[PDB]
Design a protein around this ligand. Sequence first.
Ligand SMILES: C[C@H](C(=O)O)n1cnc2ccccc2c1=O
Ligand SMILES: [Zn+2]
Length: 117
Amino acid sequence: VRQVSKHAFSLKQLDNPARIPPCGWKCSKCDMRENLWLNLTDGSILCGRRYFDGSGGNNHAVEHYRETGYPLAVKLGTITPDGADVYSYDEDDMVLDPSLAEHLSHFGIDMLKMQKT
Ligand SMILES: C[C@H](C(=O)O)n1cnc2ccccc2c1=O
Ligand SMILES: [Zn+2]
């Protein structure tokens, strides 16, 4: 392998004061509680793409990307002190965010307190 996102150091985050718990997240837009992605620009929590067999998510995170251009999302439940799964929609890859700890702090998340799913 994963390479540093071209957005890791230039990302401009919006001020979103909503409290984000350490576990038991929900899609803002549906019942989903798995394949939930936190968009690092706006703090939106939304579900991953639908699988070919119609399982998986309801496309809410990717729809939000197409509407906004906000490129980086981190998969809740993968955040450890060592890192997380971060996807970049405009680079179409799993990427490194060496600023991840800051990006998550901005929305009041402590990486040392999040729980592995
Ligand atoms: C976050 C995003 C989604 O599901 O909305 N996502 C996540 N992982 C991927 C892995 C490979 C190819 C595409 C995606 C993707 O769109
Ligand atoms: Zn959803």
